[PDB]
Structures are given as structure tokens and as C-alpha cells.
């Protein structure tokens, strides 16, 4: 019964971790794309 409780707790802590990591990985997708577009367009406007 203590294992059940500690394992429910570990599952809910892992679900909050997958959420926080996903909300970080999306912010990094969006920054990577925007940096790539800034770098392309800055070159195209230099010409």
C-alpha cells in the first residue's frame, strides 16, 4: 500500500515533468525557427 502511493506520486511527478519539458521544447522550436528566419532574411536584405 505504501508502494502504490509512492508509485502514483512518481507517475504524477513524471506527468508534470513531461508537461514542463514539452513547454520548454516548444519554446526552443519557436526560437530555433525564428533565429533561422532572421538569419536568412538578414542575408537576403543585405543583398
Amino acid at each position: 500500500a505504501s508502494r502504490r502511493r509512492a508509485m502514483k506520486s512518481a507517475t504524477d511527478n513524471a506527468d508534470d515533468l513531461i508537461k514542463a519539458l514539452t513547454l520548454a521544447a516548444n519554446r526552443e522550436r519557436q526560437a530555433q525557427i525564428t533565429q533561422e528566419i532572421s538569419e536568412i532574411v538578414g542575408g537576403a536584405n543585405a543583398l
Binding site: 538569419e39 538578414g42 542575408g43 543585405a46 543583398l47
Partner: protein, 349 residues
């Protein structure tokens, strides 16, 4: 000419980098404040050069080779052009003799040999400067022999360092007598992006002049990220379109022609050598970033100093997985090859 020195009327200089159909695009190598539109420019008739000689031993100099320690003018032996080609594949010889650093975690595990390049890459406040200054200090035991076939001369090239950090390095060398055989090239943080870009090349020219005369030389570049930032600033003011991460397209050719110019010559060229320790400061501890993976690929080995090993008492903080020297046990005395021969692989395991 392309890369001719211009002379502006304040006695300040510049370099002609762009030659357009109707104008010359120049970089000013000094106090730009004194420049006005419509004033005179004289050419110099000289491709970009610096004074050189053994008179530089013990001095602190601007990138143009003039002193800033205040101890009066330098009795320069000749000028040398900053962009002479590296010794070609036929002129070089194998690295075979050690550069003793006196640090166990380097000398046993990832040796440095005369004519190797070894990248001291790491994060802020991890020991990068401390390893290099300790290396320059250890050479005194050889210098006191007075023999040109074993004494090492040193150059320490401070790029973008603050002036009190350079003054701290200077007195930390004087405490160990290393200013008997060290030159400091100082482009402190105040100086315009021309000096901050140029400092590694004038270091390599002062070094090369002793190298081709059969002397052994050690160069420390501290640090090539501030040269790469200064060349980014120069290129963008000149309005060249940037490549990746807003760097100039040819930021690799900035560093390759700096670091390839240090090697061991054949005995047909006096058998001198130059050993390069470039430093790179990696932001957020990632080695897999643009500028560090260039310099990792140009140099012969890494001493990756990691902050989360430094904090846990492993000092000096060499990450033993990533760190390597690709010349390896060819650059060690026989006793050290017998004793330490597998130690990097045993620790990475």
C-alpha cells in the same frame, strides 16, 4: 594595395579591406574619435605588418607592436607582414618532444608537445586562464639552462580582457620570473574592434620571428571568442551579409589561418616550433555550438574544463570523456608512456 596600412592625420592607422570601383573601405586601428570627413589620408606603401624581435621579451604591447607598459620604445629587429603563409606539408616535421605543463591531469593524460595546438575550451571561471598562466610559469626550470634547443619563449595574447585582469596576469608572471621570457599582447576591452580582431595575428607574427630563427615558442590566445566577436563587428559595419549565428561567412578562415601557422619545422629550417593554446569560452556549457566546433576541428586536442566537475573538487576540471590529445603518447618521455599509457581510456570507462 589590399590590406595596405593607411595613415590618418592624427597619427592613427587603418587597413584597406574592401577596394570598391570608386572607394576604399578601411578599418581604423586605434582611437577613431579624431577622424573627420574631408581630411587627408596618406598611403604607407606597406602591406599590414608589425615590428618583431627578441627585444619584445618582458614587454606589454598594443597589437601594432608599440608598448603600453610605459617603459619606453622597443628596439625592434625588423618588421614582419601579418599574413605570410603557413609552413607547407614538406617543410613540417612530426611533433616528438614534450611541452611540460607540470599539471598531472594534462601532462599524463592528454599531453602537449612542441608544435601541437591544444584547445583549452570551457565555461566562465573554470580555470582556462589558470592552466595557461601555470603552463607559462612552469617553463622557468628550462629557461635557466640558457640553451636554445630546450628553453621556451612565450607569448600571451589577451583579447577583450579587462585592463586589471591583464595587470593581474602580468604580476602573477613576475612573481614566478616568467616576464624574463614572456611577451604580452594586450587588446583590452576598451580598444576598437580592429585591435580586438588583430591581436591574435600580431601574436603569431612576434612568435613566428623566433620560430624561424630556431627558437621554441608557446602562444596562448585568451580568448578566440572575443576575436570572433570583433571580426563579426568589423564585418557588419563594413555591411558584408552575415552567415550563420550572425557571424561573417568566413569566420572559419579567421581562425584556420591563425592556428595553422604554428607547427614544428624540419631541421632544414632551424627546427624551431610554435605551440598554440587557444582558449574558447562556451556559453551555457554546450561544446556542440558553431565557434567551439570549428576550433575543436582546427586544433589537435581538447582540455574541456566543465563547471560541474570544477564545483565537485575535481580541479583542474578536465571532463575526461570529451578531453583528448590526437598526437597522444608520441609527445611524452618514455617513462610517462610506459606508466600512463592507457589512463584516459581507464578514467572514461
Amino acid at each position: 594595395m589590399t590590406q595596405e596600412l593607411l595613415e590618418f592625420p592624427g597619427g592613427v592607422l587603418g587597413v584597406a579591406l574592401n577596394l570598391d570601383e570608386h572607394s576604399v573601405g578601411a578599418v581604423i586601428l586605434g582611437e577613431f574619435e579624431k577622424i573627420e570627413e574631408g581630411q587627408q589620408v596618406k598611403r604607407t606603401g606597406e602591406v599590414l605588418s608589425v615590428p618583431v624581435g627578441d627585444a619584445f621579451l618582458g614587454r606589454v604591447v598594443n597589437p601594432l607592436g608599440q608598448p603600453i607598459d610605459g617603459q619606453g620604445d622597443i628596439a625592434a629587429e625588423t618588421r614582419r607582414a601579418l599574413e605570410l603563409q603557413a609552413p607547407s606539408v614538406v617543410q613540417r616535421q612530426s611533433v616528438s618532444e614534450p611541452l611540460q605543463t607540470g599539471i598531472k591531469a594534462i601532462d599524463a593524460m592528454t599531453p602537449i608537445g612542441r608544435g601541437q595546438r591544444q584547445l583549452i575550451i570551457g565555461d566562465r571561471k573554470t580555470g582556462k586562464t589558470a592552466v595557461c598562466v601555470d603552463t607559462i610559469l612552469n617553463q622557468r626550470e628550462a629557461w635557466l639552462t640558457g640553451d636554445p634547443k630546450q628553453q621556451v619563449r612565450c607569448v600571451y595574447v589577451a583579447i577583450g580582457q579587462k585592463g586589471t585582469t591583464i595587470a593581474s596576469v602580468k604580476r602573477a608572471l613576475e612573481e614566478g620570473g616568467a616576464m624574463e621570457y614572456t611577451t604580452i599582447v594586450a587588446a583590452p576591452a576598451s580598444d576598437a574592434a580592429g585591435f580586438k580582431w588583430l591581436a591574435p595575428y600580431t601574436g603569431s607574427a612576434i612568435g613566428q620571428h623566433w620560430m624561424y630563427n630556431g627558437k621554441h615558442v608557446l602562444i596562448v590566445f585568451d580568448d578566440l571568442s572575443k576575436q570572433a566577436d570583433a571580426y563579426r563587428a568589423i564585418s557588419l559595419l563594413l555591411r558584408r551579409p552575415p552567415g550563420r549565428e550572425a557571424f561573417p561567412g568566413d569566420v572559419f578562415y579567421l581562425h584556420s589561418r591563425l592556428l595553422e601557422r604554428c607547427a614544428k619545422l624540419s631541421d632544414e629550417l632551424g627546427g624551431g616550433s610554435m605551440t598554440g593554446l587557444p582558449i574558447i569560452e562556451t556559453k551555457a556549457n554546450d561544446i556542440s555550438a558553431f565557434i567551439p566546433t570549428n576550433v575543436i576541428s582546427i586544433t589537435d586536442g581538447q582540455c574541456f574544463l566543465e563547471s560541474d566537475l570544477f564545483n565537485q573538487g575535481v580541479r583542474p576540471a578536465i571532463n575526461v570523456g570529451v578531453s583528448v590529445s590526437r598526437v597522444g603518447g608520441a609527445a611524452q618521455i618514455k617513462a610517462m608512456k610506459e606508466v600512463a599509457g592507457s589512463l584516459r581510456l581507464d578514467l572514461s570507462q
